[PDB]
Design a binder for this molecule. Structure first.
Ligand SMILES: COc1cccc(S(=O)(=O)N(CC(=O)O)c2cccc(-n3ncc(C(=O)O)c3[C@H]3C[C@@H]3c3ccccc3)c2)c1
Length: 290
């Protein structure tokens, strides 16, 4: 369990970014690691087998906006990125989750197209295949996995921001609606802690949010917990040693460098570190130090 870092990849400030940086909660240090081969914002990060994956996004640059179908793999042992097989379609503002060593890519946008499609990556075979699509088109969708079920939360369907959510049951290759959130959220951070799916922040169509609510998969209720100190949309999120960490985002005025940490035992947030520069739309995941 020792030696794990919080990795943040890509993001946005003025343009899409190629940064890969890793925070050590044990000593407060940040490390700058190998840049992404292509700058990307609106991507998602995940880890399988100790390897860090960067999935989808968009390269917003002065000379273009290119939505990404890319899957790239970072090995901390080598400090090198390697391309993997690309997805069927570009997916900006994507959500991803891992079930039993397989990466699920959910939703996202391609130009004005809002995807309901979903595809699954097999790392050993380096292949993507489409699975059943969601019941709703969703970009800026939050995704997390609990008890080998995959949850897609909120987002934007092309017309409305959403409080709805749904769950994918792999053995039936089927999606079902779950209880909707209390709050409309696009671009929230979604993660799993204990027996709940948490949705932190986002944009409700009017303001960036500091509220946080959690879905109890047993009781099927959404309950608010303590709000974050900072309102933020397009934040990064992960869980580490029983606590939630939120990284960066946009508060309506500033691209935040703030990293906050939620303690579920006390139901409190605290500010634990700052990123090296403010940014939004990062991918985040946890694995061993390089
Ligand atoms: C002012 O500049 C910025 C401020 C913050 C972030 C960024 S971003 O570069 O990181 N980026 C932006 C990109 O992909 O082009 C991005 C990435 C992931 C999630 C979201 N996100 N969060 C809420 C909503 C919403 O409006 O419902 C959306 C975004 C998708 C939805 C949207 C966009 C346009 C019109 C309607 C709806 C955005 C830029």
């Amino acid at each position: 369990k020792v030696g794990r870092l919080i990795y943040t990849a890509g993001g946005y400030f003025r343009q899409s970014l190629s940064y890969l940086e890793a925070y050590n909660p044990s000593n407060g240090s940040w490390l700058r690691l190998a840049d992404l081969q292509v700058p990307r914002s609106g991507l998602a990060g995940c880890v399988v087998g100790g390897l860090l994956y960067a999935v989808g996004g968009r390269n917003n640059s002065p000379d273009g906006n290119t939505d990404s179908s890319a899957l790239d793999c970072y090995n901390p042992m080598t400090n090198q990125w390697s391309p993997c097989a690309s997805m069927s379609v570009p997916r900006n503002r994507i959500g991803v989750g891992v079930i039993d060593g397989h990466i699920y890519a959910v939703g996202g946008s391609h130009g004005c197209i809002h995807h309901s499609s979903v595809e699954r990556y097999e790392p050993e075979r380096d292949e993507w295949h489409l699975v059943a699509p969601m019941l709703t088109r969703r970009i800026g969708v939050g995704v997390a996995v609990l008890n080998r079920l995959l949850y897609a939360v909120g987002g934007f369907d092309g017309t409305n921001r959403l409080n709805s959510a749904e769950c994918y049951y792999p053995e039936r290759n089927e999606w079902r609606m779950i209880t909707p959130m209390n709050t409309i959220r696009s671009g929230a951070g979604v993660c799993v802690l204990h027996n709940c799916i948490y949705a932190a922040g986002g944009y409700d169509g009017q303001d960036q949010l500091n509220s946080v609510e959690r879905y109890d998969v047993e009781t099927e209720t959404w309950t608010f917990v303590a709000p974050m100190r900072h309102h933020r949309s397009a934040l990064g999120i992960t869980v580490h040693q029983g606590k939630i960490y939120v990284l960066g985002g946009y508060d309506g005025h500033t691209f935040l460098d703030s990293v906050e940490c939620y303690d579920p035992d006390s139901d409190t947030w605290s500010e634990v570190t700052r990123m090296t520069s403010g940014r939004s739309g990062v991918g985040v995941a946890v694995t061993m130090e390089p």
